[PDB]
Nucleic acid binder design. Structure first.
Length: 51
RNA sequence: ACGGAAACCUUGAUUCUAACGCUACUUCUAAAUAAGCGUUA
């Protein structure tokens, strides 16, 4: 989206939301990702950032 | 020492019976708690 002070993403490129008088066209409402069953704290470590 | 005197337009009566402010309607739609590590030493 170049119509602005600095560029940003075009959120309307993949259509989402309801439209007035138009058929519902949300693709990523059809993809529904559930979360995980909780795992244990025995699987956790204390890593550090290296660049 | 009057066409005059005496005489309640009065008694008893429920503006009452029956009737759902009800029927239908997702607070809904997309969205990684994530990005940047320069320069000096």
């Amino acid at each position: 989206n170049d119509f602005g002070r600095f560029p940003k993403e075009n959120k309307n490129l993949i259509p989402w939301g309801p439209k007035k008088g138009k058929e519902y066209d949300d693709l990523f409402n059809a993809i529904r990702v559930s979360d995980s069953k909780p795992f244990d704290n025995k699987r956790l470590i204390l890593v550090q950032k290296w660049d």
